Design a protein around this ligand. Sequence first.
Ligand SMILES: *Cc1cc2c(cc1C)nc1c(=O)[nH]c(=O)nc-1n2C[C@H](O)[C@H](O)[C@H](O)COP(=O)(O)OP(=O)(O)OC[C@H]1O[C@@H](n2cnc3c(N)ncnc32)[C@H](O)[C@@H]1O
Ligand code: HEM
Ligand SMILES: Cc1ccccc1C(=O)Nc1cccc(OC(C)C)c1
Ligand code: SF4
Ligand code: F3S
Ligand code: FES
Lengths: 138, 613, 239, 102
Amino acid sequence: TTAKEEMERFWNKNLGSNRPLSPHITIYRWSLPMAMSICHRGTGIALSAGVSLFGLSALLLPGNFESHLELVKSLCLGPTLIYTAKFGIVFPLMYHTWNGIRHLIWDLGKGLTIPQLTQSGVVVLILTVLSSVGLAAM
Amino acid sequence: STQYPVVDHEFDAVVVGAGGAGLRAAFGLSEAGFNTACVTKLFPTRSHTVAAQGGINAALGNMEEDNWRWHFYDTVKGSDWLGDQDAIHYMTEQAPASVVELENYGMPFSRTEDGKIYQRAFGGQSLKFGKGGQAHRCCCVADRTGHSLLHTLYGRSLRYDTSYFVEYFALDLLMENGECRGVIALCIEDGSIHRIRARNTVVATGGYGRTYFSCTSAHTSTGDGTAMVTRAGLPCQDLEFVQFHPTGIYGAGCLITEGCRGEGGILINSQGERFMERYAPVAKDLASRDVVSRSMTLEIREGRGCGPEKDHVYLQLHHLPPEQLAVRLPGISETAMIFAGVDVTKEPIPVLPTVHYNMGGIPTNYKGQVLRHVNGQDQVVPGLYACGEAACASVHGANRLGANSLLDLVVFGRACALSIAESCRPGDKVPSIKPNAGEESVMNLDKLRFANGTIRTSELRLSMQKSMQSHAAVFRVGSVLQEGCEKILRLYGDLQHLKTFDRGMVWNTDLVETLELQNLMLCALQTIYGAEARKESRGAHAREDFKERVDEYDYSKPIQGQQKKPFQEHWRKHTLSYVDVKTGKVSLEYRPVIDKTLNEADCATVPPAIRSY
Amino acid sequence: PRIKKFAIYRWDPDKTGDKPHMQTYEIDLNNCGPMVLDALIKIKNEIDSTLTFRRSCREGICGSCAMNINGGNTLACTRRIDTNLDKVSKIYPLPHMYVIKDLVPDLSNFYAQYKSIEPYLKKKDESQEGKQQYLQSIEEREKLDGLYECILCACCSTSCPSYWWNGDKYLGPAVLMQAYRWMIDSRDDFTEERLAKLQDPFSLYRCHTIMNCTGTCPKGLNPGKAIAEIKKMMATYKE
Amino acid sequence: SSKAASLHWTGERVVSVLLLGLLPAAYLNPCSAMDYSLAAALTLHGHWGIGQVVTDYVRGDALQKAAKAGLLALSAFTFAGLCYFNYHDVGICKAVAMLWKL
Ligand SMILES: *Cc1cc2c(cc1C)nc1c(=O)[nH]c(=O)nc-1n2C[C@H](O)[C@H](O)[C@H](O)COP(=O)(O)OP(=O)(O)OC[C@H]1O[C@@H](n2cnc3c(N)ncnc32)[C@H](O)[C@@H]1O
Ligand code: HEM
Ligand SMILES: Cc1ccccc1C(=O)Nc1cccc(OC(C)C)c1
Ligand code: SF4
Ligand code: F3S
Ligand code: FES
């Protein structure tokens, strides 16, 4: 028997049987590096959903951008309620931006030990809040 | 009958066991062009050669310069002259040829300045025929040698068209009129019974260390091929000879390598004295195992023990440089940190002489052929081979040398391959077996599955283990051995009273451990009765009542005027044991030791001499 | 007297309709060894001989007793019971894997993947082999450190999120680390074509450096790091 | 023998150092030429993002091409719209500016 012939036999036995899949995420321990990777996907998806909604609306919806802003302006927008709507757009961006560097550092090969992963994980989490609050006030 | 699906297979040669020796015998056959099958209860990596730490002996001469003819003298000495010199000759010459074979397979051997395989000092090995000081010929992949050995063999084995029955517990051998036809086996996955017939059968099932309460060996060291052979009515050699490794953790019995003593590790008692100086002046703490374990156990009798129970001893590694301790011995650095909780660089390791290697097993030709005893003479069992720990060509003899087993594995594994490739051809007529055969192998299996007795399986196991541990240990006497014999014999009758709880097919470990039990008891009975029968002190088997090296002559004085003893008077002979399966009573006879070499000119016979270091 | 609680995943394939449930067992710690394997053996030997599991070395060099204890994938003979008495220790079979019988998972796919990466020394000459030893300097030997020790416990790949969803086509850390192990071996000649084995988006490129493999290794190895080195070799290598 | 997954993997990192470089470059140097190069890097890096998500979760063969086809539609439509916004409107630099300062 060859290598990839044994793989064919594996599925053609298990799929046509009464064998259950062992609980995966149902019981598996939560960890920071894993939660930070889940978030990086969520932020990625959320941002592309935003950018695509900006591109599609540029073609499909009529009326210029200045008129769209005056629709927002004439909603008697709140003092901090405008800051919160702003902050909730910087927070997803700045997390994915900073952690984007952390993923990029791993591509060179640096900081791949367990302590370095946990250290830079907090560093990304912290530098985000600063760049989020800092920009929403700018 | 009719319950189990009888599935038959057709092959050229079958290998039972996928660890080291078995693995080497397997692909070596496919290399020759044989339709080879390999039956194993474990996944080949989960075999027990993986646990090996010390290394593998080969006279390559990379450290200084060596001669394989010196490696012969050392093994034939350590064997306490029970060793068959025809096998030792073949092994010591094939040694560099089998190791360079492994390095060329990809075994990541530790390296030197030249870029050559790193050898190192080990228990009882000497240059210039035991005259030129300590020898350094133990090749090693830094403390995880048997791990690399098993991996690089297995890795190289996928390069051939061998069939592997992974997790298939071999029940009994297939036998028809003195000849072996293959093996009957139980699938652990679905529970179906498979009969695998072939022209030849190699047996490499390893030792039966699980006969004792305290051992270094894995939970799956149950000497099954040893039992398979005895159920066929075939003899078993040197079974009373059991190696007690001096260094094993006080807890579960985890092995710390003898490479500790080989690199610079020193063994210390309660008073603080290096107790391996008054016992052994020349070789000292790096002497033979039957001298070190003999000393350690005897030191506890004095009351010079260590710990809250006064039963264990210490091994110093504190003084060693951290520079080489983390490099040469990182595997024991981690495993002594877990079970003992001991900083390997600052604090000494707690050790204890525990059961380790099985010197005896299945009587084996120097070419790997299984032997039987007919009319005082030797006889080849047709279509049957054995290599490794389960085998007893008795290349190790009364006491095995440090790191000589992994050699016994590869060399005799290769031998088992060559001797099949030379004697017969692949595609030759596979002998037909009776459609009714393997009849009571099913009956034995089916009774153990349905067992509705009174005595629990685990509770009968520990009864054997403690009865062996106390009665037949390092030191043993005819008073305690006699009691132990009738203790084990009466226990064999208790096997018909056992209670099993699992009534299932898929992965019935409850059933396979009971099959392990039956295969352990048979290995236990012959060991205990063999110990009682032998009334001398030769290597590992030490008698406090018969502390005598009983040879043909007294080899201290020159043999000239002395008259020779008859065969049934001296003890320099192999113990051959049989067991009747129903009654359980052990009938045992004897056969002579091979003292001739392969070629006298190329390698001279070494006569019996003084036994000390 | 000192009691500890264990909750274990149970599934019997013999009784039809028997859906996976949990069963509790209680054992005194003074009568038991420190490790989880000692506990499993004790309830196997005394309380219920219907519990099934793979075990061998009890030394932490097989990968037999590899399971999910308390949310993590390690060895049962290496990891010790939490002496905390009130808390119940949960033991499960390795995650997202087909269960043959309770705690015993099917590894046929896992082993077959290790076969497909060709884990043996390959040369141009097979004629001059077996007779002379290959030369390798201590530095070239040092590059194998932290890679040869892998025991194939499969705690690694069974913890990888990509290996869960893509168990079929993606190899996983353990297997990939070994593929790397044969690349940096100075003796090996087939390094360039070993990399060519992974030119599809699934073989290697499902690893997004999530990093659960290294954080679960019972032997302390760093497979994730090795994957990044493969990636590095994949973009740099010549021809 | 061709190495498609090798060169593609490098490309993602090349746009990643471009996109990371462009964000401060858009702030410090806000221009018309910056607006288009930003929209290109945004949509491309995003297209090679969801492309990886599809290959991960989307199980199937006929399904696999459908999601990839549909993803290319939105990717093209997003990039077309962002180009249209840069030509016939204010520009994405000023879009943020008028959104932030006002
Ligand atoms: C116990 C031990 C031994 C040891 C060592 C450390 C320990 C803890 N370190 C060594 C070292 O550093 N250097 C050295 O030279 N030797 C060392 N040893 C001794 C040596 O490793 C052993 O002699 C060796 O492991 C024996 O190997 P063998 O080829 O005889 O086979 P195995 O490894 O014991 O594995 C047994 C195989 O047989 C199959 N099997 C057994 N029963 C069945 C049944 N019922 N049905 C089907 N298959 C069966 C198993 O599958 C297994 O593969
Ligand atoms: C300039 C800062 C950014 C950098 C450096 C960056 C880089 C990265 C990296 C390294 C990944 C993960 C790839 C991996 O290593 O596995 C990723 C994911 C992703 N990015 Fe960004 N990114 C940035 C901002 C953005 C922006 C502005 C968008 C636009 C929507 C975006 C869209 C996405 C998407 C959709 C993913 C999904 C890939 C995944 O999570 O598997 N990113 N990015
Ligand atoms: C495939 C992938 C790539 C990058 C980042 C995350 C994932 C992913 O799906 N992980 C995943 C998905 C669901 C649950 C989960 O566990 C949590 C319960 C800890 C992990
Ligand atoms: S690299 Fe470590 S965690 Fe992965 S399979 Fe090997 S021993 Fe297990
Ligand atoms: S858990 Fe994972 S996706 Fe990569 S870093 Fe390890 S294989
Ligand atoms: S049994 Fe060998 S790893 Fe636990």
